[PDB]
Amino acid sequence: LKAQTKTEEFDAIKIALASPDMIRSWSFGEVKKPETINYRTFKPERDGLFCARIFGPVKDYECLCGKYKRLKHRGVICEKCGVEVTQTKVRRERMGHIELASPTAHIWFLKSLPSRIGLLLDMPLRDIERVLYFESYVVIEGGMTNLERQQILTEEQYLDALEEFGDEFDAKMGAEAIQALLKSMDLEQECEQLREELNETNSETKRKKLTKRIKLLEAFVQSGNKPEWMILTVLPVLPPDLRPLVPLDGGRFATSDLNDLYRRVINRNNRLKRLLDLAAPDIIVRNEKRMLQEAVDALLDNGRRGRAITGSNKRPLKSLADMIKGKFRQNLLGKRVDYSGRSVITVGPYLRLHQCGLPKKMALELFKPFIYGKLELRGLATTIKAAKKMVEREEAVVWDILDEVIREHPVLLNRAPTLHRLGIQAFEPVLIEGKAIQLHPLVCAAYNADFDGDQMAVHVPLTLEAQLEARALMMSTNNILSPANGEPIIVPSQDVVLGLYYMTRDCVNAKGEGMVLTGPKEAERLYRSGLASLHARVKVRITEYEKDANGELVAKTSLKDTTVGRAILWMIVPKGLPYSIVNQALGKKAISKMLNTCYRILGLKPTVIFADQIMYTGFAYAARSGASVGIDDMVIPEKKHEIISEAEAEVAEIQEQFQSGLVTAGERYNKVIDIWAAANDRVSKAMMDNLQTETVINRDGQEEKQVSFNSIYMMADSGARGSAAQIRQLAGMRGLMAKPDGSIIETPITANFREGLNVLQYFISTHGARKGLADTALKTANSGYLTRRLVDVAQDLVVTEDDCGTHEGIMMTPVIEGGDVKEPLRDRVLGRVTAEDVLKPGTADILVPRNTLLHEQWCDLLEENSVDAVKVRSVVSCDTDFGVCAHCYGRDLARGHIINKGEAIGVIAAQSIGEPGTQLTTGGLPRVADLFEARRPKEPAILAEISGIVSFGKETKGKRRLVITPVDGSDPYEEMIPKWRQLNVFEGERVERGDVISDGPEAPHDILRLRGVHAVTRYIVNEVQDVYRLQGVKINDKHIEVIVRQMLRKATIVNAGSSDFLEGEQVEYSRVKIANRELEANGKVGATYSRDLLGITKASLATESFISAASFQETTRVLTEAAVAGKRDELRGLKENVIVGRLIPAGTGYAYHQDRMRRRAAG
Amino acid sequence: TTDPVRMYMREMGTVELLTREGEIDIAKRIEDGINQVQCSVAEYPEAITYLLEQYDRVEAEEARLSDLITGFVDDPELAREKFAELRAQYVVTRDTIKATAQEEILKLSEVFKQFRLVPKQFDYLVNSMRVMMDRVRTQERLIMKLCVEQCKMPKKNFITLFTGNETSDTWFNAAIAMNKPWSEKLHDVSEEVHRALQKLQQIEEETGLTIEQVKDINRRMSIGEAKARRAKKEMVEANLRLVISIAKKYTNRGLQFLDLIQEGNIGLMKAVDKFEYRRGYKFSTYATWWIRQAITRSIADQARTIRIPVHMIETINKLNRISRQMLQEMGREPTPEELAERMLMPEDKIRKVLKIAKEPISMETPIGDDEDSHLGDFIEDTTLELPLDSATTESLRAATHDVLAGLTAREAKVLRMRFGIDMNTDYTLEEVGKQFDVTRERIRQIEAKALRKLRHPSRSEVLRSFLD
Ligand SMILES: Cc1ccc(CC2CCN(c3c(NS(=O)(=O)c4c(C)noc4C)c(=O)c3=O)CC2)cc1
Ligand SMILES: [Mg+2]
Ligand SMILES: [Mg+2]
Ligand SMILES: [Zn+2]
Ligand SMILES: [Zn+2]
Secondary structure, eight states, X not given: OOOOOSOOOOOOEEOOOOOHXXXXXHEEEEOOBSOOBOSSSOOBOTTBSSXXXXXXXXXXXXXXXSSOOOTTOOSOBOSSSOOXXXXXXXXXTOEXXXXXXXXXXXXXXXXXXXXXXXXXXXXXXXXXXXXXXXXXXXXXXXXXXXOOTTOEXXXXXXXXXXXXXXXXXXXXXXXXXXXXXXXXXXXXXXXXXXXXXXXXXXXXXXXXXXXXXXXXXXXXXXXXXXXXXXXXXXXXXXXXXXXXXXXXXXXXXXXXXXXXXXXXXXXXXXXXXXXXXXXXXXXXXHHHHHHHHHHHHHHHOTXXXXXXXXXXXXXXXXXXXXXXXOOOOOOOOOOOOSSEEEEEEEXXXXXOTTEEEEXXXXXXXXXXXXXXXXXXXXXXXXXHHHHHHHHXXXXXXXXXXXXXXXXXXXXXXXXXXXOSGGGEEEEEXXXXXXXXXXXXXXXXXXXXXXXXXXXXXXXXXXXXXXXXXXXXXXXGGXXXXXXXXXXXXXXXXXXXXXXXXXXXOOOSXXXXXXXXXXXXXXXXXXXXXXXXXXXXXXXXXXXXXXXXXXXXXXXXXXXXXXXXXXXXXXXXXXXXXXXXXXXXXXXXXXXXXXXXXXXXXXXXXXXXXXXXXXXXXXXXXXXXXXXXXXXXXXXXXXXXXXXXXXXXXXXXXXXHHXXXXXXXXXXXXXXXXXXXXXXXXXXXXXXXXXXXXXXXXXXXXXXXXXXXXXXXXXXXXXXXXXXXXXXXXXXXXXXXXXXTXXXXXXXXXXXXXXXXXXXXXXXXXXXXXXXXXXXXXXXXXXXXXXXXXXXXXXXXXXXXXXXXXXXXXXXXXXXXXXXXXXXXXXXXXXXXBBSSOEXXXXXXXXXXXXXXXXOHHHHHHHHHTTOOOEEEOOGGGOOOSSSBOHHHHOOOSSSSSOOOTTOOHHHHHHHHHHGGGGGXXXXXXHHHHHHHTTOOOSSOOOBOSSSEEEEEOSOOSSOEEEEEEOSSSOOOOEEEEOTTSOOOSOTTSEEOTTOBSSXXXXXXXXXXXXXXXXXXXXXXXXXXXXXXXXXXXXXXXXXXHHHHHHHTOEEEOOSOSSSOSSOEEEHHHHHHHHHHHXXXXXXXXXXXXOBOOOOHHHHHHOOXXXXXXXXXXXXXXXXXXXXXXXXXXXXXXXXXXXXXXXXXXXXXXXXXXXXXXXXXXXX | OOTHHHHHHHHHHSSOOOOTTHHHHHHHHHHHHHHHHHHHHHTOHHHHHHHHHHHHHHHTXXXXXXXXXXXXXXXXXXXXXXXXXHHXXXXXXXXXXXXXXXXXXXXXXXXXXXXXXXXXHHHHHHHHHHHHHHHHHHHHHHHHHTTTTSSOOOSTTTTTTTTTOSSSSTTTTSSSSSOOTTTGGGGTTHHHHHHSHHHHHHHHHHXXXXXXXXXXXXXXXXXXXXXXXXXXXXXXXXXXXXXHHHHTTSGGGTSOHHHHHHHHHHHHHHHHHHOOGGGOOOHHHHHHHHHHHHHHHHHHHHSOSSOOOHHHHHHHHHHHHHHHHTTTXXXXXXXXXXXXXXXXXXXXXXXXXXXXXXXXXXXXXXXXXXXXXXGGGGOOOOSOOOHHHHHHHHHHHHHHHHHHHSSOHHHHHHHHHHSOTTSSSOOOHHHHHHHHSSOTHHHHHHHHHHHHHXXXXXXXXXXXXXXX
């Protein structure tokens, strides 16, 4: 079988140097003239940068001269002026060339940070450049004489040198010389000579530098490249259309800057071809050459020189390199999109959560071609041109059509910062009059949408795959659980929770007090008709269920003691739940957990429609309630002014003491600030005691008091809005503010918002406010950088294998942060899968048998016993190379089951972590980066480098050496510690490797090195979570672990047999290859390694795909460094596959990539 | 510091300025140089007869007088006689080779030296000379390699009987019998060296000169040639500074500084070619013309992305001037039809002129916000044909196809024929008539009824909708 020739479908991509002969391969004619277009007949001048002869016809399937204009003639190259007649398209495809007179240095390989032509010859830059500007001569193949092969001579020196040995020694200068040097260089030869030198002379200064070169050369050998190539004979020209000369209005033209450049190269090149035939003196033809060497470089990468400015325009012209770069990092906004639109969003409580409110006017335009299609499908339109006219006419017929084409056809809604995957969600469209989008209220949470005028965009899933993807993955209803922490993200929001709370809440005595009812049905009949108060204490008959059988529903009836409200509500609740869940007061918390359990017990569908019922209902009764807010709602404690004057007298006290010198000045500042900070806590807990319960009401007897029904309390107690924090600024005094300084002011704002603030008090209120806005604006820019860092280090990571079959894992315990249980065990371990079976307190008792996915029942069977710590599989431990086995991950999803093969978790990990990032304030958000960046701390601790007994030797030469002494082993470890930092180590005591040998923070690096992979991995996860969880943010460890996994992708070698000894490389490759010697060729040996902690920013920097690399790293450098080596990208990763516009190798594409990936390296 | 002005500035900063006299030192050496070859060319037999053969082409009408000579030392009539004089001295010198010929071959060249040739032709001769020396050098090297490298013979004794001859067999077959270590060796290649000796002694026939003389001439010429360039080069180098002083004037005109001085440096190279010190005109002020010529001739030429004719450029300059007298003169600025009057020409051409006179614009011109929206980002593609349209087209085909099949097979062939429909070209109605054998007015009727048919509905309904 013959492989192929023409256009098949590629995988992989190669980059390399181009031959002059190769560059000629591409051209369809040498551009010979700086002419563009004619100036009157704006036709293109042959043969100059824009040409038909060389590139293509200016108009479709039409000869230039016009002889042949008929579409029948295609492969015809017209006789007058050489023009094959084809699409004008080819003027965007066909390249051209220029032959250079004298050789020319390619600015990339000359000036890309570490000069390639430089270090390839092992020749300094300032020398090579000198040879180029004709400042000095350099020998080449210096022969048996006096002179080194790469030695440089001066005018006068070269002269004299010549008098001696005429021939048999050779010197040149300028590009031709370098080109000479490179040509002659034998890489194969230099490879053998450099190998001798390595083994002969033993030096770290000598054989360290020695090794790095010889690996680089045989790279270049094996590359495919030839060194000469870096010096240009032939220069390709970009198809015109990409540097077009198009006309504008009022008749002026506009053009790409390349033309200024290109023209200049062409010109100077020509004027030089000229100078050679005029036999001009060397001083000029030299000068010219230099100008050509420049004019090229301004063309290729302007800026590695003086930066030629564009014509008449001060601004410098865009060179090819600056054409590639695009946009700190990079950023890369790009790709506008058809079938898309947007407008302001509004509410729609009437929506089912699986849909959304889309304007007639939008939908008409969006689905337009679809309509054209359904229109002439049924025959209402004779033809498409009619359909166009029909919908243009907005004929009434169409709307009945549009509803068809609309129906089962999801659309995508996406809002501004797309942060977690829930930033895009798919809904089923419901037609709307108005130019607003109607967005279901429960989703508004995920979107971080307010309705203060936020706008969202829409997108039509065109292709069938896209519809089904939108329906089975991106649909609203599939994401009701957060992927960051499996708690419901689709929890009732604010209006709706006040509603359920006010509904399921009770007062002391009201209509209906104490009667008894058949069931909720007549509870509502009771209320609607004004007989009972919504909240009145009542015994009613209710029927709960519990499916506690083996997947089977048990029914139970009882006279539960409840309220009219909670009764009514039981009408919503599905089947297998307890009446207990609705019997409380139902705050925003309880109301969410409710939802959660519903999911975890009855499955998806039932939660979905449950959640809907809750909104509708919550809204409904929210409405009935007539809750409101007036001035009188915000009640000042009657004691306030008193409290102030008391704490106010206290300052007058600490003053008397200061004026009297009893107390010092600074002493006093912190003292006063405390008594105020204190008074404030008094006034705080004052109003709240009054506010909270002081609705006092009477039942039959005398008196009783209960939690308030005051408008404003209900808001906070429920959790609908407000926090005791904010409240405290309404009624009680508002805080102490601090000046721009950071120095918190010693006379707090004693007045509140219900009162006025005065002139000074407001003005002080200003700073914190202004810093407030400012700060959060930046902690925006910071979160954003972070999340990008993370995806950049993660991304390509996907669930690949099913079970990597490791018994290995990390040990999960509750956090116990000094006090009590800052985080529980049930939380850490839920949804994770067990390393090894867990036993009771007594044993031979397998409660959970090795790896069982620890779901909710299980966590309770665990919690039933006192189970105190569980080992769990974590991504960081997973034996799988190049991915993550489903088992070691966990289950998590917005779906509750275990993670499926192919889900692209690195991303969602990144996302999940960085999204909430906005809410952070050592400590704070930067404190996170510091961790993920693996940044070593300023003033570190140091650890026992090895176990055994220690002692001090030598003395105070800036460092008093510490000498550790092992029991069995060799003694030789002595590290020299600064004696001007306080020790903790006991000087005659034995120390475990990884003990505290001074105090202070430690670098994660030590923890890794000295204490272990699981140690550091635990260091990171807990210390970072220390930050987020202080802030009330929930992120399942799974995520932090995937990042940690990526942090230690790399390792360094220590044994021998097949690899490079000192090299840093991916453990993946080792793990595979020491396994590829352990039963393979020779033991050889080997090799032992060392896991290395990389900061994410540094890890990410190493990536196999060079295309991926040009995305985020610096593009010029990436390409050069990669191009010389003749490097092949085989895609495989995500970024790059998008870049190149093919199926993502994860998710749906995973299936495809796999099926193809095997067809490769096959038969 | 890289920037090629610097390394140029310095490299020519070395070359020292000429004395008032030093201009003549070099001026003289040039004349010597040329004159040397002018005399070296005169001495060539084929160079004479060629100018003869070439003039016989000019009176028989196969060339022109402007194409051969550039005038002499001193009219079509005058030329005819000067040529007889030349033809005359040739025919005498020709038959005289019986010695005293020397006295006359010296004169033949004299008349020949009066002739100022077209530079093109001048070189051709020079060319035909060195080409013939290459042919001599070809046969000289074939005889040496076939002897020294192949048949193992010393070049030390190879050159002993060679000098004075290298044509006859006094070296080839008579020095093989000297019974030297290299003597009996020379017989194996005897067929290859003596058979190629055809072109070598034949050159003494074409050129009419022994291999002896042939080398001497264009050798003394080569030296003269080198001699001259050497001095001219030198002359140029002296004045590079001058170019710069001039070029500093024309800077922002749309061409790089160094772009100027290199074109101006070419003006200097020119002026050095056409100059004669014998006119007492200082090389200084005579050179400033040729440079300032080439600067401008270049500028006007190539500093535009859209190149415009020279008059056009000059037409423009006048215009910026006229608005100057009249800018402040008219309180504001003169109307578009005002300068129109000042100018000599149609005066509406002002609009026409003024429009092509604009330079194109950087597509990568930043537009508002300074933001990365750039001009080119707004330039829409007009060559494209949008999909509602590509759609209707895939469709018009469909309709015309169906509408014509629902017709009569002859009315289809008749219609597909009159129009370009799924056929190359369309056919003249007569062209159509002959194709069916039943013709003329007839086919035109078949046609009209077919249209007539497709005209009302059942049929009409669909096609109509394509009309907007
Ligand atoms: C050989 C080689 C490879 C890569 C580079 C760097 C270029 C790549 C293309 N590039 C951009 C997009 N590519 S994309 O597929 O459209 C896209 C989107 C959208 N989001 O992520 C991706 C990737 C932009 O958008 C955008 O801007 C500019 C920088 C240079 C040389
Ligand atoms: Mg909101
Ligand atoms: Mg807003
Ligand atoms: Zn043509
Ligand atoms: Zn695993």
